Design an enzyme around this catalytic site. Structure first.
Site, short mmCIF file in Angstrom:
data_model
loop_
_atom_site.label_atom_id
_atom_site.label_comp_id
_atom_site.label_asym_id
_atom_site.label_seq_id
_atom_site.Cartn_x
_atom_site.Cartn_y
_atom_site.Cartn_z
N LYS A 100 60.11 20.24 27.22
CA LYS A 100 59.07 19.22 27.28
C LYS A 100 57.94 19.70 28.18
CE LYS A 100 62.84 15.92 26.84
NZ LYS A 100 63.54 14.81 27.53
N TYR A 134 61.54 9.77 18.14
CA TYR A 134 62.02 8.71 19.02
C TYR A 134 62.10 7.34 18.33
CZ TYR A 134 61.58 11.85 23.07
OH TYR A 134 61.77 12.88 23.98
N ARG A 152 74.73 21.26 24.98
CA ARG A 152 74.62 20.09 25.83
C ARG A 152 75.20 20.39 27.21
NH1 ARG A 152 77.70 15.66 24.34
NH2 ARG A 152 76.07 14.25 25.15
N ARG A 203 69.26 21.13 33.75
CA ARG A 203 68.80 19.95 34.45
C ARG A 203 69.35 20.01 35.87
NH1 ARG A 203 67.17 16.82 29.94
NH2 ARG A 203 68.56 16.79 28.12
N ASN A 248 61.69 14.43 32.25
CA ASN A 248 62.47 15.63 32.50
C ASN A 248 61.92 16.86 31.79
OD1 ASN A 248 64.53 15.69 29.87
ND2 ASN A 248 63.88 13.65 30.51
N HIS A 252 65.25 18.93 26.13
CA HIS A 252 66.03 18.14 25.20
C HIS A 252 67.06 18.99 24.46
CE1 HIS A 252 67.25 15.64 21.87
NE2 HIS A 252 66.78 16.56 21.03
N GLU A 269 66.89 16.77 13.53
CA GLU A 269 65.81 17.20 14.42
C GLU A 269 65.18 18.51 13.99
OE1 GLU A 269 67.58 17.18 18.23
OE2 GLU A 269 67.83 15.00 18.29
#
Lengths: 151, 149, 151, 149, 151, 149
Positions: C12, C52, C88, C105, C115, C118, C129
């Site tokens: 992002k 989203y 993940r 993260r 953040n 993704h 996606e």
């Protein structure tokens, strides 16, 4: 704001001796925390006695103060959202056999007694410890959090 | 001994701003040099003015003080053999176009004016800078060199 | 094969701004995953609204789309064994207070809302996606998995 | 402004193959340069031929196209002050025996022919290469430099 | 002392091939463990058969020995406090889907069968494995632990 | 082939002591060179004496043997194209004041006498050093170069 929370982090004499000051600071930096206090010092016994007052009685105390007095320590105040809680996580659990790879104690210390680093365990404990190690002038702010960090 | 030479490195406000403090420190530790002074401060105009006093009449003086005052910096004294000369090589040459990859300026700064870092250029500048930026009780030495100094 | 599994990873605008693109890509690389799609883009609101959509109603939506629209994003498709599940894990739990040191993260973000990164949470969600962010020509294969990745 | 200069860096198939993409990107980010274009593609013969057209009659032409086509590459446009000249220094000189440790070739490639990476050698080659490898809608700029370009 | 504990760590042929020898050694180094044995070898089938004797029956055995025989392995003996227990933690859980970011398998392997690294699971198992891979002369000591490491 | 050249690198006792083994190895792997010999040993006086035999009459001989014997070292044979010449560049020049940041000496040693590391200076010294420090069964080659050697 809560994003004006502050924590105390000390690098003990073996952290310095093993040349880990850059690596430790850099971890907080890339996390996105702000440095508001940094100082290199030879801690007085008085200071250390006061710091470790809750254990002023236990057998290990004397040699523990001695260790911390024995070399330069780096004193730090870091600022940011949940910096106390997150800060403990970045350090790893205090016991160096429970410390997971990727944390600081995890990647870096083995000895439980004479370890590398200290972190505040609470917001109260942090304020207490920041009071003790830092004069209010040695806290530089420029994050416009100084006006919020009152308790 | 000659292994008691000290030099002064400052990390200018941009360096702190960009998150390069630890990295910069790491380079000196891993080279082998001893940390004997380290603080995080807002430099005063009175200090910055005295520090850059050899330039006090150049047209950029005021703005250079304003840059160095505009944010907190990290001051450092490092110890070791040829730590001044060697420390100058590790930063790379003053102009970040002549700077080589592998040096601190080389790897990290683009702008010549506002740049990342300062190092002493001589043992004499070091003695002067050091005493200017640090009270002597602020230094921490254990290396049995403190006497030699 | 299962070793033709694919996942979507987006960096992002704050990940980019903080100069973390190299570091994030390098983590997948050294894991042993294969890059099959990589693209640098300014996301349309349409795309972001569709992405989203499950949250098209909740209060935070508007500002969330705004954030993602506000800067360049890096879109990625990575390939390999259990790359969705493992992916993940490499990111850490979505909440930046539960994220363990060593994850992305974990080492790198603090703010929960705005953040860094993704990741797909399922194989279904990934296909959805990947469809949305990538044209089929922008997926380069040379891992002879293209002929297996049909659903 | 002069801080709007763009240059083109390609990571040749071996570089992608060896897992060096992130590392290479990291060096440019941490120097301070702005990413304004980044894609992962299979270069076509038609593109590779046009790209290396100044060499179209040398004996190695065909094989060099075959190398660059043989696997996917990563194309990039980076932005900043002297980003072309500076980017050439960061890669190290074209011949990986004259290359110095601390540069990308220095740290990473051994073979002269098939090597890791390409960078533009001039602002003019950059403009040409850039437009050749990227449609202009593929570029992403937010740095208020896009106008200057 | 307990601080004379020793463990066996092998880097299997894919760890070497992927150029991970420096990175793996460096992790033990910065932890604060001491190197007491290091050797680069092409393992005989005899050695590998003996090493993997507990599985001399299971179906995968043949191809597993084959993998380990197929390239150079790095054999290591590391010394220090709880080096067996901590060593397994630094490696991560053996299954490459349970391995957490920050551990070696965590950051570096995906394939469960042909992985990167081995570690002793017990002090007994370590002594057994050190016996098998190392001659007593190839163990250098200079940590004055040699005189304590008797069993 | 020329890509079968081997060279010998030793990490002297200080290098092991300071925890720099992995780092040093990492640099060679990531450059692309092949590891074909690696051991951790206490060098004997008889070996160290034979190894430094061209210096056997200089005044520092005895003490240099005493240094190299004083702790365990890591010996290595690395393989690849120009691995001797290239390996010399990666270490940096023998005198750790002329050494440049980005090289191993540059980044890591300060002292000239006791320093971190040794590398062969010629294909001939390499052949000699290699055979001196390694029995030929200690070498591990799979690179189809073993024959060429």
């Amino acid at each position: 704001m809560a994003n004006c929370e502050r924590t105390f982090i000390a690098i003990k004499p073996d952290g310095v001796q093993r040349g880990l000051v850059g690596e430790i600071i850099k971890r907080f930096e890339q996390k996105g925390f702000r440095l508001v206090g940094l100082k290199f010092m030879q801690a007085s016994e008085d200071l250390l006695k006061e710091h470790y007052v809750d254990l002023k009685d236990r057998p290990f105390f004397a040699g523990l103060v001695k260790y911390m007095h024995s070399g330069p320590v780096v004193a730090m105040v870091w600022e940011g959202l949940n910096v106390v809680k997150t800060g403990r996580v970045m350090l790893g659990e205090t016991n160096p056999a429970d410390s997971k790879p990727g944390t600081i104690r995890g990647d870096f210390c083995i000895q439980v007694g004479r370890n590398i680093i200290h972190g505040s365990d609470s917001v109260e404990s942090a304020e207490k410890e920041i009071g003790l190690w830092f004069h209010p002038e040695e806290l530089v702010d420029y994050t416009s959090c100084a006006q919020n960090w009152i308790y």
